[PDB]
């Protein structure tokens, strides 16, 4: 079947940065769109950042586009989210995805377990 594992969350302080990534097996990797959403508590959850099979990046706001850069690696069936700035109000759960059309909206194929970060100050 197909597995989406995130991993690299943790506890950090704010203006920290920190990389999480995602490892994708049981499909073709190159032939999707692979996304990052998150949710936060008392949130729905969101678009944060998306990387087509193209190659074009696409962020969720200008709170985003900013601070976080993301980025695939086809030869290692991985993707990577470098979140750099982080404030409180980015704690939340990390969610990768993958979907072979969509780029925003949030009803993604294929879904992670999730990575929690936690950001205090």
């Known amino acids: 079947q197909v597995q989406l594992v995130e991993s690299g969350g943790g506890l950090v302080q704010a203006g920290d940065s920190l990389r999480l990534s995602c490892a994708a097996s049981?499909?073709?990797?190159?032939?999707?769109?692979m996304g990052w959403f998150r949710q936060a508590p008392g949130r729905e959850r969101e678009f944060v950042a998306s990387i087509s099979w193209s190659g074009d990046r696409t962020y969720g706001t200008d709170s985003v586009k900013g601070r976080f850069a993301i980025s695939r690696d086809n030869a290692k069936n991985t993707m990577y989210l470098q979140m750099n700035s982080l404030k409180p109000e980015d704690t939340a759960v990390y969610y990768c995805?993958?979907?072979?059309?969509?780029?925003?909206?949030?009803?993604?194929?294929?879904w992670g377990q999730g990575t929690q970060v936690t950001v205090s100050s």
């Open positions: 995805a993958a979907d072979r059309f969509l780029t925003r909206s949030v009803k993604y194929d294929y």
């Open positions: 049981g499909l073709t990797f190159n032939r999707y769109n």
